[PDB]
Ligand SMILES: *[C@@H]1O[C@H](CO)[C@@H](O[C@@H]2O[C@H](CO)[C@@H](O[C@@H]3O[C@H](CO[C@H]4O[C@H](CO)[C@@H](O)[C@H](O)[C@@H]4O)[C@@H](O)[C@H](O)[C@@H]3O)[C@H](O)[C@H]2NC(C)=O)[C@H](O)[C@H]1NC(C)=O
């Protein structure tokens with residue numbers, strides 16, 4: 001969301017996902033643990 | 049995240065940052081580097097699971113205090129007995 | 130409160146306090162020997 005307010009700021013996509021999960025009140029530890037599962041589910045939903 | 053003793057430490061808030069020489073944590077919206085310590089971060093799991101983690105020591109504020117009390121007690125009651 | 134229940138609450142500092150007590154100088158190990 002950085003560039004929205006102005007200058008764009010490079011960030012890792014995983015870091016962004018962790019920040020979103022914090023936004024919905026979820027700990028990033030699970031996200032890091034299950035990166036593979038989240039990515040697979042996301043890709044499957046995209047195909048669907 | 050970071051590994052100190054085979055365990056994964058993550059920032060409570062902010063983000064880790066390093067321009068080489070050293071590692072710090074700071075609030076995301078302002079460049080305010082800070083020493084990473086126990087209170088700054090929190091533990092979760094071990095190192096292997098995550099991807100891209102790196103290594104660094106995590107300082108404990110309580111340890112130097114109890115070490116001062118150790119200097120007072122451990123090495124003063126030595127030879128009187 | 131209503132419906133509160135029973136359970137001990139752990140103190141994370143307690144194990145370190147106990148270790149400090151056990152291995153502080155020589156108390157309880159060699160100070161008490163004489
Ligand atoms: C980008 O590199 C900068 C180079 O300075 C980082 O500066 C930080 O500044 C603090 C102190 O103001 C350092 O903590 C101590 O710094 C003293 C002296 O400061 C500088 O010089 C030493 C070498 O004499 C160097 O090691 C320091 O890093 C500083 O460059 C040192 O004598 C101490 O040993 C101790 O280092 C920080 O360590 C230093 N951080 C880093 C990564 O070097 C600035 O923090 C850097 N920015 C980011 C986001 O990491």
Ligand SMILES: *[C@@H]1O[C@H](CO)[C@@H](O[C@@H]2O[C@H](CO)[C@@H](O[C@@H]3O[C@H](CO)[C@@H](O)[C@H](O)[C@@H]3O)[C@H](O)[C@H]2NC(C)=O)[C@H](O)[C@H]1NC(C)=O
Nearest residue numbers: 049050051052053054055095096098099100101102103104
């Ligand atoms: C951060 O610290 C850890 C623990 O030291 C580093 O792990 C390193 O990983 C490699 C591969 O496992 C180790 O090399 C060899 O691994 C085999 C199989 O486990 C083992 O039998 C050998 O004895 C040897 O350990 C390596 O020893 C191990 N330690 C180091 C200093 O490389 C990790 O690479 C470090 N850096 C990070 C996470 O960025």
